[model samples]
Target chain A: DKIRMSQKLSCWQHILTTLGTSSKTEQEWNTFFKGFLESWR
Target chain B: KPFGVNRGLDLDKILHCYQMNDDLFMFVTWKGCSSIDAVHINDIKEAYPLQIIKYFESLRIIVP
Candidate 1:
């Protein structure tokens, strides 16, 4: 059962983002990225 | 040889991540507004902001 969980890996894997390849504007990504940094603060 | 993975950054599917230890690198394909770019959680809480790691937990992204 545990082996099946590989479909859902942990944050330790260090790869986080949307599901697949995506394209976005610079401002858009900057906004999102800022949101990301704020969460850390 | 399959279980342990290091932090060299493999760009599969435009990986966008921030490692607090590694200069907060971001990976993504800029849409029409980009030609090039430059950019970390080093995998240790003691070396990074708690929320950084927490987001990874919250987002729960599946690494390929």
Candidate 2:
């Protein structure tokens, strides 16, 4: 139960790699991910 | 789902809603059952939990 919950999902891992460790505002991150998702289509 | 004792567990961590574009999906978090995590979703289906797990597992690297 002690493990960091976010580490279990592949999407989260991919997202981390895609976004990197650098922090961004929530809005910026959302916009980035939205664009990335659109690109997947 | 409101968090507290006696109101039952918070399975309402994820919500299935329309996307304004008429897409039906459930907004879920990375942990499956937490409101405060990575919010995302899978398209609507009768067996939503199974679909969610399948989608989560599908993203694995699966190295040999």
Candidate 3:
């Protein structure tokens, strides 16, 4: 329970913050995901 | 589909197009973690779109 909860929170925090700003454009989102995927890999 | 292939759909716009229902939001959150913990590059490659399309299709089935 603890591990799953922590993982879910961590995941939620990361995405929410990444998406925190309301106005990011399509290009910006594309760029962000590209960079994020690269680093994540 | 090749890597970097554009689906002509902006995920950011698509996400914003939605009303951010609880299930959709949670799935996106879960997807972010799935991407992070992905064991191989190919894993994310395969899973990302598959899961995303699944999510979108589910939405359509419900609403349409």
Tell me the TM-score of each prediction against the true structure.
Answer: 0.23, 0.25, 0.27
Off by over 4 Å in 3: A1-3, A21-41, B1-51
On residues A1-41, what C-alpha lDDT tens digit does candidate 1 reach at each position?
12122322332232333211145556755565565545434
Stronger candidate by TM-score (1 vs 3): 3
lDDT of each: 0.36, 0.40, 0.36
Query: TM-score of chain B, per candidate?
Result: 0.26, 0.24, 0.26
Better of 1 and 2 by DockQ: 2
What's model 2's overall lDDT? 0.40
Best by lDDT: 2
Candidate 2 lDDT by residue in tens digits, A1-41:
23243433333444444346475677766675565344323
lDDT of 1 at B49: 54
**lDDT score, residue B9, model 2?**
34
Candidate 2 clashing pairs? none
Which residue pairs in candidate 1 collide?
Answer: B18-B40, B19-B40, B19-B41, B20-B40, B20-B41
**Predictions' DockQ, in order:** 0.03, 0.05, 0.08
Instruction: Give the Cα error of residue A21 in candidate 3, in Å.
Output: 8.1
lDDT of 1 by residue, B1-64 (tens): 1211133333222234544323454333233332212223233234335544454576756878
Ranking of all candidate structures by their TM-score, best first: 3, 2, 1
**Better structure of 2 and 3 per DockQ:** 3
Candidate 2 residues B1-64, lDDT tens each? 3211112333343422213132233334433344422222332244357655665566555768
